[PDB]
Ligand binder design. Structure first.
Ligand SMILES: [Ca+2]
Ligand SMILES: [Ca+2]
Ligand SMILES: [Mg+2]
Lengths: 882, 262
């Protein structure tokens, strides 16, 4: 029959559970009080057996652990199914299927409790665990129900608390190892278990009204409704459609808010954060056939990446599809991700470390065309950055020696360390741009011919042609900055009787300027180094067919000098006669870094120079710094040193600053302060001190070049100019006049160096005098320039042509002073004396009809054939030896 | 005579009839000399407390078909001599406890044709002199146990037309019918209402064996078994695990130390 429930007896099950728990507690406490008041161990053996069984230390242990997990889930499902049935009912054990499964499950749980008790260390504290408590209040009631053939859905919700011991189960099985996963499983298990247990208690209390009201408060809430109610409650929402009405239910709500709202607000955000841990820029790069890809690593940042991308992918170069793959450890920020979005089909980013061979194999450096390692120029410690860069290159070499590398080195000696790497196969291809070396070579070149460093730097940056309506100096300057350095294979028409004589004067036909080996002004299959404005019209050559010297003689050498034999003082410096010389102001301190002045003095002492024509060099500044750099600056001739400081007017008066050919302001302590505002303050003060001097005439027209670490300071060098932070350095008046220089203009070198590897070494033979396979080997092994007795072949290695500045007022070229045809001028320069002019060094106010007292001159690179000239003008040339 | 209501009809011997007079409430001026009162077919919807005051010697009260839906607890105070009540054919949905307690001389209490969903033990109170009851045409789903336990002299009862849900809640009910055999004509009309496996089943056909599953009262054997089942089972499981572990350990030890060389 049905309607089997008349008189209640929940006290049966409840009292059975309570007497079990309390009897265990009291017997354990009685044993403790009795103990207080008074082979190898078989008890320890069985305890160890149980301990091994509970843990997943044997196959039996793992089977039992998995069974515990599965049967805990099964008992929870049994409770969920039984929740629909009334609170009290009568059911037959041997005619029902759910009761038998429940009986088997709780018999297993009883056996597991026995094993846990045997393995337990402290019995009393094991009795009070949540697992033991839920065992005491779940198995006995089922046994009593089987005995009575009567089921009461009482504390069965406590089965949900069996869900807590799931992290421990997984950690035993070695599945759960890492901290994040363990914490996530802990949080999830605690949250779900507490939620379900609270829902079950509310279900029991609301369905079985409070006893003191004679059970007249039945609300009849389904278990799902109680789950929903608890979710709305501990979420702080509180809809109010469903709520507890009984006194016991409201009391549980009051005491559960305090401990459960905090649990929700502390667990949900943490769970979301933990699940949210993912690697966005993972995965590998697919190597598409027929399209080469290069890899870029090192110092990857928004400004560096933007500059490299805008110079690399410029429309001026030919229609070539080279795909860039960036590899950085730090995940990009929003601006960098947007920049990558704007180049969606041209670049990719993959997060990883260049040290790990896994990440190297991920970007497929095995099939890469080249690897480019950018450097952090603006670091507080150059040695650390060079060391990190050499680690990066050595890791790439370790993975793949055959790859070709372009890298930036902040110091010259670390370049020599790079030569020590076994797979530095510079023959087939390899590059190493030393920023200090190339910067100082450019400075020395500008010392020989002012403003040459500006055009050298502008030849390498990719610039599209721009036009301005107003007639200004910028208008003519921008017609020169648009010319880049390209390489083209020669035609079959010029490969006949002789390359040289056909090379000259034919630039009218090709409308381009030409500059098996490196060739510069070839007089007396080859790659022509053109200065065309674009790569579209460079395809017009081949397509159209109508003890004094050094060990090599490349430089000058003299006997070593002691620092005391060259140290001077204001009296003897003023006594000494110096005109048209070079003065180098040096800023430094005790703990300042090492600049390296050898790459500044070497370019000025090539063999094309005569000892009489050799320019004197005097370094003015602190004597400690020059002492530190002296070990390399002592095998050098005709160099003087004045202690003191460039900020003292008298010290500068002694060294004859007014008549020097070039004053070079340099700083070394610029790597100490990282303050943008404070950088180059000594250099700005020194430059302005030079400008404001007076000589029995104002020194504002003294040729001076300042090397600035910070580009933004370029506005303080000159005062009669327009200062805008928006404009770029190449557009600034001091840079266009060759009086300012920064390493930031050399970063384009990589983009050039990759696209034609010759250009870099051409730089090394167009600045710094010359670099041969031998001299690099000698520097690598000795690191000291040495010389010997001259030989005829040594002296014959002097045919080179070095840059020179030619006036225009007096000379056979006076007829062309205002001829209005610059092309006629250089065509004459070529036929009459085999001389090629890069371009024009022109007064800033020359384009204006009204005269002025200005002296600043800017640079024009390759003026058109129909270019008007002014008699007040300067010409860059490549003079030959004699 | 002053003992007769002005609107009602009285005859010698204390018999008064007030029916078919459209009385909206109890007529005033009740006297002690009236023994039987009629009030049927009126419109007395609400019964004021102490309405029948004054006629303490009344013996029979009729209120059938009077639109009764709410009766106060003290409306029948002082009616100790009242014996016959006819409250049937009304809309009484609930009876307040203690309402009929003063009625020590009650013999027939008619609640037929009412909407009484449940009658509670406290509603009838102490009724020792009660001889018979009529609960037909009511919504009494089940009689709470102990209601008949304060009616020692109850020998006649009518239960037709009720939503009798045949389960363990009416076990005290049928126990009466076994010792008070309902006559066959009326017995055939009392049937279970729940549409389960017990429809068209007369209440006298259900024996004890059919409801052996029903909660029997707490004994002294089971009282002790239910307390002892838990701890005894836990101790048995613990001992079984201990014996299994000790035996396995001893067997593995004797296999390992006796075959160390082999
Ligand atoms: Ca261009
Ligand atoms: Ca300015
Ligand atoms: Mg792609």
């Amino acid at each position: 029959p049905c309607d089997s429930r008349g008189q209640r007896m929940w006290w049966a099950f409840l009292a059975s559970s309570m007497v079990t728990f309390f009897g265990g507690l009291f017997i354990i406490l009685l044993w403790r009080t009795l103990k207080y008041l008074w082979e190898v161990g078989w008890m320890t053996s069985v305890k160890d057996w149980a301990g091994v069984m509970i843990s997943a230390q044997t196959l039996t242990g793992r089977v039992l652990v998995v069974l515990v997990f599965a049967l805990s889930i099964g008992a929870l499902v049994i409770y969920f199914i039984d929740s629909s049935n009334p609170i009290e009912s009568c059911q037959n054990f041997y005619k029902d299927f759910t009761l038998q499964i429940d009986m088997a499950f709780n018999v297993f749980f009883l056996l597991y409790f026995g094993l846990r008790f045997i393995a337990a260390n402290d019995k009393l504290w094991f009795w009070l665990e949540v697992n033991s408590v839920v065992d005491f209040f779940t198995v006995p009631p089922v046994f009593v129900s089987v005995y009575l053939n009567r089921s009461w859905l009482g504390l069965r919700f406590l089965r949900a608390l069996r869900l807590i011991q799931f992290s421990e189960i997984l950690q035993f099985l070695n599945i759960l190892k890492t901290s994040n996963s363990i914490k996530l499983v802990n949080l999830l298990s605690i949250f779900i278990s507490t939620w379900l247990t609270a829902a079950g208690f509310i279900h029991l209390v609301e369905n079985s009204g409070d006893p003191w009201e004679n059970f007249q408060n039945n609300q009849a809430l389904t278990y799902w409704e109680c789950v929903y109610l608890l979710m709305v409650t501990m979420s702080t929402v509180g809809y109010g459609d469903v709520y507890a009405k009984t006194t016991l239910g409201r009391l549980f709500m009051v005491f559960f808010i305090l401990g459960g709202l905090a649990m929700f607000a502390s667990y949900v955000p943490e769970i979301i954060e933990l699940i949210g841990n993912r690697k966005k820029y993972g995965g590998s790069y697919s190597a598409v056939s027929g399209r080469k890809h290069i890899v870029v690593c090192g110092h990857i940042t928004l400004e560096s990446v933007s500059n490299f991308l805008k110079d690399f992918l410029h429309k001026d170069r030919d229609d070539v599809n080279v795909e860039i793959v960036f590899l950085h450890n730090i995940s990009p920020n929003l601006e960098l991700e947007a920049l990558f979005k704007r180049h969606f089909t041209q670049v990719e980013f993959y997060q990883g470390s260049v040290l790990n061979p896994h990440d190297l194999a991920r970007v497929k450096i095995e099939s890469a065309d080249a690897c480019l390692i950018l450097a952090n120029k603006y670091c507080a410690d150059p040695d650390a950055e060079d060391a990190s860069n050499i680690m990066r290159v050595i890791s790439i070499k370790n993975y793949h020696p055959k790859i070709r590398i372009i890298t930036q080195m902040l110091q010259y000696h670390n370049k020599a360390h790079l030569l020590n790497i076994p797979s530095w196969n510079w023959k087939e291809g390899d590059d190493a741009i030393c920023l200090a070396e190339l910067k100082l070579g450019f400075i020395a070149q500008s010392c020989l011919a002012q403003g040459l460093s500006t055009m050298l730097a502008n030849l390498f940056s990719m610039r599209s042609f721009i036009k301005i309506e107003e007639d200004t100096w910028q208008k003519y300057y921008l017609e020169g900055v648009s010319n880049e350095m390209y390489t083209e294979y020669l035609s079959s028409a010029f490969v006949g009787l002789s390359f040289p004589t056909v090379c000259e004067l034919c630039f009218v036909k090709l409308k381009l300027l030409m500059i098996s080996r490196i060739l510069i002004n070839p007089g007396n299959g080859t790659l022509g180094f053109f200065i065309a404005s674009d790569a579209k019209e460079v395809k017009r050559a081949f397509f159209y067919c109508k003890k004094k010297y050094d060990s090599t003689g490349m430089f000058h050498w003299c006997a070593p000098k002691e620092i005391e034999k060259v140290i001077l003082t204001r009296s003897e410096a003023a006594m000494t006669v110096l005109s048209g010389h070079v003065v180098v102001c040096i800023f430094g301190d005790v703990s300042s870094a090492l600049i390296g002045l050898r790459n500044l003095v070497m370019p000025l002492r090539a063999s094309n120079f005569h000892y009489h024509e050799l320019k004197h060099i005097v370094f003015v500044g602190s004597i400690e710094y020059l002492k530190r750099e002296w070990e390399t600056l002592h095998n050098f001739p005709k160099v003087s040193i004045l202690p003191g400081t460039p900020l003292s007017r008298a010290d500068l008066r002694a060294v004859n600053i007014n008549l020097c050919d070039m004053c070079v302001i340099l700083s070394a302590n610029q790597n100490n302060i990282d303050d943008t505002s404070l950088q180059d303050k000594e250099c700005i003060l020194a430059s302005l001190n030079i400008k404001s001097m007076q000589f029995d005439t104002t020194g504002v027209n003294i040729p001076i070049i300042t090397e600035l670490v910070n580009d933004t300071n370029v506005q303080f060098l000159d005062q009669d100019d327009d200062d805008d932070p928006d404009t770029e350095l190449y557009l600034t008046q001091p840079f266009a006049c060759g009086t300012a220089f920064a390493v930031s203009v050399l970063d384009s070198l990589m983009s050039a160096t990759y696209f034609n590897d010759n250009i870099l070494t051409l730089i090394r033979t167009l600045v710094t005098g010359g670099a041969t396979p031998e001299l690099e080997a000698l520097i690598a092994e000795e690191n000291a320039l040495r010389g010997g007795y001259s030989t005829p072949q040594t002296l014959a290695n002097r045919d080179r042509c070095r840059v020179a500045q030619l006036a225009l007022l007096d000379g056979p070229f006076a007829d062309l002073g205002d001829g209005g045809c610059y092309g006629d001028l250089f065509c004459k320069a070529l036929k009459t004396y085999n001389m090629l002019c890069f371009g024009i060094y022109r007064l800033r106010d020359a384009h204006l009809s009204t005269p002025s007292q200005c002296t600043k001159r800017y640079v024009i690179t390759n003026p058109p054939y129909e270019f008007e000239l002014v008699p007040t003008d300067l010409i860059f040339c490549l003079m030959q030896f004699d | 005579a002053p003992d007769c209501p002005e609107v009602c009809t009285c005859v010698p011997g204390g018999l008064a009839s007030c029916s078919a007079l459209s009385l909206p409430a109890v007529p005033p001026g009740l006297s002690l000399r009236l023994r039987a009162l009629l009030l049927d077919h009126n419109r007395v919807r609400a019964l004021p407390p102490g309405a029948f005051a004054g006629a303490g010697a009344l013996q029979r009260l009729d209120l059938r078909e009077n639109g009764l839906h709410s009766v106060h607890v003290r409306a029948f105070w002082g009616l100790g001599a009242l014996q016959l009540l006819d409250l049937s054919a009304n809309q009484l949905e609930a009876l307040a406890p203690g309402t009929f307690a003063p009625l020590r001389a009650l013999r027939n209490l008619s609640l037929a044709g009412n909407r009484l969903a449940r009658l509670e033990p406290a509603a009838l109170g102490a009724l020792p002199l009660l001889r018979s009851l009529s609960l037909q045409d009511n919504e009494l789903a089940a009689l709470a146990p102990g209601l008949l336990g304060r009616l020692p002299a109850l020998d006649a009862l009518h239960l037709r037309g009720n939503p009798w849900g045949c389960g363990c809640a009416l076990r005290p009910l049928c126990a009466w019918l076994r010792r008070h055999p309902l006559p066959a004509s009326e017995a055939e009309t009392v049937l279970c209402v729940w549409p389960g496996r017990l429809t068209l089943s007369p209440l006298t056909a259900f024996s004890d064996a059919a409801f052996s599953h029903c909660a029997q009262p707490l004994a002294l054997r089971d009282l002790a078994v239910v307390y002892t089942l838990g701890p005894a089972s836990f101790l048995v499981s613990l001992a079984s695990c201990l014996a299994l572990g000790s035996g396995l350990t001893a067997c593995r030890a004797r296999r390992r130390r006796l075959r160390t060389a082999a």
